[PDB]
């Protein structure tokens, strides 16, 4: 039996123990789960616009207090009067103020220029910080759609434009949507599609830190897997400079003399900070970069203090101690407190006593006391987060910063203990045995005192491997404007010329996985850091040298077209096989599928030249029975590579023998099945090697339809000026002889068989005999457009009869791709060794609908991995949504800090009928609709508003949409439907519909 009462109750014990070991790590991850700070964003006083720019303002001791802003239209004259009690005057003669908060990029988001004018400068600087903190983390900001991601923004209600009661001249419906902190967290979750809790925090000088507390909580509860915490205090008005002066609290110099005897007020500054918070387990499991770790944050109130504004000591001690208790740490653990340091000779005394009580009472080493407001100024709701960026930069650089204007230690504070040393000099603060911890404090004017604990990120990042690879991963970048496209290559060139030695695959991985796909794409496959910074120096000016550039809005899914004959060179795929493992494996698989039916192994054939066969008295790839299997093999291998690099087909087009590849890659037939088909076919297609042959020519279809005769009739329609005719030697030579003198050239391809005619049925006996019923038709994986019927048909229609029928009637390749554009798909990849008929589909798109994008894999005499990298580059630049977690699935690539989006900022500040003549009418209504659009869009420059951009990405929300439809219902005098903005998403579509509604 079971060894009574010794192998069960000991077996039940290990589970009442291990479940307990699992039900306690749940409490410890529900309450003391150390959350990581994934990325940093900051727009701080001075020139600070990025977290790395804040360090050389903080490490070399630069004060950001310069002067009051002049961009904002401030009075600046009634702000200063000798009488200190005059209503309307401010006491501080400066302060650290943002020089870029006045400007914004409206067209970047789904925001109208008028709406962005109505947007609070806080809410317009917060969206950019959100985009930066997402692009800094290697997380595509457009990849977080309908995902749990909380937004926690600390804010200060600030007066902006005219009274809501008085409305405005253009800002009538959007003025609330700016001057409400409500949408100051919802707008960010709306533009980025974040689904997690969009919460705005308002506790004044502690808001952001209080905010991060909430975000921390939302991580330690699991409500949101990710959070974007922080706070902003951007001042569009001098109002509280006038009002803080009435209580006599502003420093006349505007400088936060934290813990100094020369302090004469708490100063003021405007700024903004944002933290990307994720729990450590999720941060490391997902691979998100962990800068530092918020371990424990506490939020408390001052209680019944000496007024609402005066701080409280016991409450501050209580919140600082509660942060340590909730973080599981003690006073000694914190190596460098960075407390509020308001700047006044009243708040600093009280708060230093609280620091000495919570920390200095039991200290082993002198606590390094600092204050970010000394370098920046009191940023209010941006204070509490700004100190967090300080410390995180301190631990990512291993140095404790200075506290400016702190040489004269305050005489009202007892520093005789020595447990607190004010950071007046840069103290080396290196990584060691002790986990490097510290603590940020923020005590708001509302009385809410809050404290967060920041530990250094556990140094487990070390251990990465090193290697080298021949894969030239594309350096892909994208922006919302052409100028931004030229600015995202200049800033990247600046970063790779000022931060040299960063390995190219790391840069490609960070640019590819970490940057959103925006509708102006530049992509190039670099070979060196000198051939890349040269392309980045030509892309900054607009010259497309060694790169691919494309505007590809509303384009996400690609079509795989399969050309037939045309690359008689066939000296390409040797390099691809020799350099690409996938082409060295898929080719082997399809060859070993071809070998049981056609003994020719494509491997000896591969390693050779284009003139190899010519030396053995044989034309370049002319033997049908030997050639058709090799195009099929190279073709299916190229398609397998394209699907292995993340590009999956949407539709499939097979010109002549691309139907076999449609069978194979789309899942309709297996590798063996489709190989068997082309093998058995090649032998019953090489049985007609007499006078037969085709002659591709740009001769017009409506005239060759009269030229049909002498056995030479159309076999394929590859475009408007592209016709493949097939016949015997009756009209063969005379076609060239009688056409070449009239600027029309007959491209007589070196072929010996005719297809898509009445001659294939001469082998109908053998074609139905030497094909067999074994490649049973199966519903595959990709939709396919038949080139025998010219229609989108089932994936299960595919037998020997289908192969006969395809080689029987006209291909109608032009019709197939016209229906392609019609079904919603706009991009096609010419998988082949050389892209014959590349301009044919550009001709198709030129004379019908919109222009199509001709992506090709490789060219004639171009088969190295550099050319395939250029293929991926031109695919991305032309709108193809490449998967960059597959190109960089493994190459020894790691995330690297890169410059964020270059927001093309423009100053947006709010201060307190045609009788059917011709298609000239089409373009006249077009211009009319555009002008009424860029007058309800607040585009003061009516000049242009992108034609390919939707009515939901130019900020055409209700107000804009409704007034637009009313303007059109008056100018054109029509009855546009109520949901017209949804019926016609584009100004192109709207104009076409309106000019089509003439009767």
């Amino acid at each position: 039996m079971a060894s009574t009462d010794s192998e069960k109750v000991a077996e039940y014990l290990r589970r009442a123990t291990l479940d307990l070991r699992a039900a306690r790590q749940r409490i410890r991850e529900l309450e003391g789960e150390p959350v990581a700070v994934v990325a940093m964003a900051c727009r701080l006083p001075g020139g600070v616009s990025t977290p790395e720019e804040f360090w050389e303002l903080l490490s070399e001791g630069r004060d950001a207090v310069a002067g009051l802003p002049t961009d904002r239209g401030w009075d600046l004259d009634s702000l200063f009067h000798p009488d200190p009690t005059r209503s309307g005057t401010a006491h501080q003669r400066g302060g650290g103020f943002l020089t870029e908060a006045t400007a914004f990029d409206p067209a970047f988001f789904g925001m109208s220029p008028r709406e962005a004018l109505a947007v609070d400068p806080q809410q317009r600087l917060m969206l950019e910080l959100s985009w930066e903190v997402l692009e800094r983390a290697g997380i595509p900001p457009t990849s977080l759609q309908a995902s749990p991601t909380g937004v926690f923004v600390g804010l200060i209600p600030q007066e902006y434009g005219p009274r809501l009661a008085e409305g405005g001249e253009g800002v009538e419906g959007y003025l609330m949507t700016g001057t409400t902190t409500s949408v100051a967290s919802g707008r960010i979750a709306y533009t980025l599609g974040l689904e997690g809790p969009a919460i705005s925090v308002d506790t004044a000088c502690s808001s952001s830190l209080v905010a991060v507390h909430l975000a921390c909580q939302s991580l330690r509860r699991g409500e949101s897997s990710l959070a974007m915490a922080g706070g902003v205090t951007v001042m569009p008005t001098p109002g509280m400079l006038v009002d803080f002066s009435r209580m006599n609290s502003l420093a006349p110099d505007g400088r936060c003399k934290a813990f100094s005897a020369g302090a004469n007020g708490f100063g003021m500054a405007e700024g903004a900070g944002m933290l990307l918070l994720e729990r450590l387990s999720d941060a490391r499991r997902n691979g998100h970069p962990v800068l530092a770790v918020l371990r424990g944050t506490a939020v408390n109130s001052d209680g019944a203090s000496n007024g609402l504004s005066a701080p409280n000591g016991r409450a501050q001690v209580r919140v600082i101690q509660q942060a340590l208790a909730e973080s599981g740490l003690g006073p000694a653990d914190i190596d460098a407190v960075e407390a509020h340091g308001t700047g006044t000779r009243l708040g600093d005394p009280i708060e230093a006593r609280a620091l000495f009580e919570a920390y200095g009472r039991d200290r082993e080493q002198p606590l390094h006391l600092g204050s970010v407001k000394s370098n920046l100024g009191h940023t209010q709701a941006a204070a509490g987060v700004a100190g967090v960026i300080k410390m995180v930069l301190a631990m990512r650089a291993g140095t404790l910063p200075r506290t400016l204007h702190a040489s004269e230690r305050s005489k009202e504070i007892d520093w005789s203990s020595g447990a607190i040393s004010l950071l007046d000099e840069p103290e080396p603060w290196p990584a060691g045995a002790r986990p490097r911890r510290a603590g940020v404090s923020s005590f708001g004017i509302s009385g809410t005192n809050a404290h967060a604990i920041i530990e250094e990120a556990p140094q487990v990042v070390e251990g990465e491997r090193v290697e080298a690879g021949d894969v030239v991963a594309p350096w892909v970048l994208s922006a919302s404007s052409a100028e931004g496209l030229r600015a995202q290559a200049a800033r990247l060139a600046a970063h790779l010329r000022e931060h040299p030695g960063q390995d190219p695959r790391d840069i490609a991985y960070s640019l590819a996985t970490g940057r959103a796909a925006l509708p102006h794409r530049a992509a190039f496959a670099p070979v060196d850091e000198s051939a890349a910074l040269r392309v980045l120096d030509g892309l900054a000016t607009g010259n497309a040298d060694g790169a691919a550039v494309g505007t590809s809005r509303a384009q996400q899914r690609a079509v795989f077209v399969f050309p037939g004959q045309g690359w008689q060179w066939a000296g390409m795929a040797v390099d691809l096989l020799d350099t690409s493992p996938v082409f060295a494996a898929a080719l082997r698989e399809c060859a070993d599928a071809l070998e049981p039916h056609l003994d020719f192994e494509v491997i000896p054939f591969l390693r050779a030249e284009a003139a190899r066969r010519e030396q053995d008295a044989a034309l370049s790839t002319e033997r049908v029975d030997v050639v058709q299997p090799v195009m099929f093999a190279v073709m299916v291998s190229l398609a397998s590579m394209w699907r292995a690099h993340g590009v999956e087909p949407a539709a499939v087009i097979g010109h002549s023998q691309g139907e076999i590849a449609a069978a194979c890659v789309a899942g309709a037939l297996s590798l063996d099945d489709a190989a068997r088909v082309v093998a058995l076919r090649s032998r019953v297609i090489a049985t007609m090697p007499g006078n037969k042959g085709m002659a591709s020519i740009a001769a017009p279809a409506g005239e060759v339809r009269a030229r049909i005769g002498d056995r030479v009739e159309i076999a394929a329609v590859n475009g408007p000026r592209s016709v493949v005719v097939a016949g015997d030697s009756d009209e063969l030579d005379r076609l060239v002889a009688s056409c070449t003198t009239e600027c029309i050239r007959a491209k007589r391809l070196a072929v010996d068989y005719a297809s898509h005619s009445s001659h294939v049925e001469t082998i109908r006996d053998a074609l139905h005999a030497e094909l067999g019923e074994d490649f049973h038709p199966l519903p595959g994986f990709v939709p396919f457009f038949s080139t025998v019927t010219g229609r989108w048909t089932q994936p299960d229609e595919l037998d020997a009869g289908y192969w006969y029928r395809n080689l029987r009637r006209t291909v109608r390749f032009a019709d197939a791709v016209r229906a392609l554009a019609e079904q919603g798909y706009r991009t096609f990849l010419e998988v082949s060794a050389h892209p014959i008929l590349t301009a044919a589909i550009e001709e198709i798109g030129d004379g019908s609908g919109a222009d199509l994008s001709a992506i090709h894999s490789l060219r004639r005499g171009d088969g190295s991995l550099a050319d395939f990298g250029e293929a991926l580059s031109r695919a991305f630049a032309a709108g193809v949504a490449v998967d960059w977690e597959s190109v960089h699935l493994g190459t020894g690539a790691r995330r690297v800090p890169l410059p964020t989006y270059p927001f093309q900022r423009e100053r947006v500040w709010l201060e307190p009928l045609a009788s059917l003549p011709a298609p000239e009418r089409e373009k006249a209504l077009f211009e009319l609709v555009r002008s009424h659009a860029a007058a309800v869009l607040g585009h003061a420059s009516a000049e242009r508003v992108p034609a390919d951009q939707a009515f939901a990405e130019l900020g055409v929300d209700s107000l804009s949409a409704l007034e637009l439809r009313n303007r059109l219902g008056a100018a054109t005098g029509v009855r546009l439907p109520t949901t017209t903005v949804f019926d016609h998403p584009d100004v192109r579509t709207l104009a076409a519909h309106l000019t089509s509604e003439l009767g």
Partner: antibody
Amino acid sequence: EVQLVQSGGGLVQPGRSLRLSCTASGFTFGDYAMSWVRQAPGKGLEWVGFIRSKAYGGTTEYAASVKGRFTISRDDSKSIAYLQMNSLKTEDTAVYYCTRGGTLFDYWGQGTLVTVSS
Amino acid sequence: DVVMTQSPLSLPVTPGEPASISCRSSQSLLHSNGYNYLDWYLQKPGQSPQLLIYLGSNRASGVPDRFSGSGSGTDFTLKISRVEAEDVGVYYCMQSLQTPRLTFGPGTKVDIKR
């Protein structure tokens, strides 16, 4: 985490030998008692056998039907448990399960479909 | 002898409903320890079984709270406070008094109720 990854499928005829290997990852293998449970098609579980923990003697206990033939062994150094199936009769056509306890079958592993047909 | 057990083999459940599956044992599974020695197990349709409850009432780690166990020495009851698609399958009543364990019993065939 913990996994009880299995292997040992294939083709056997009445009167042959087979091996069922269970690899445990996540905890110490020596103090858990391995068990093999079988899934007859159409019904739930039936327990095949169980070996004691290494320090609990490591003695075995199977069902009377599979006594002896279905040997149960284990090992910590390479951390592997063997069910050697011997003379699989046609009643051994079943899904076998590696259980993580003599009386407390915790993880159940994945499940190997062993077929015994002529 | 052996503690041969019975259960409601064909107990139906419907979404949004609390269900009460039971087991009845011939002998007393309450050991001198004072702890009931019964185990509740769940087999998913075409998947590996899982250990829901041990010692009569307590959870296994990773098993949702929606299962609760109780009962006396002979009668045992598991209530599912809220049934879902993951709470469908076969429920096994396992005695830990005598182990040889020849079979797992008939098992409770749980189905979504219409």
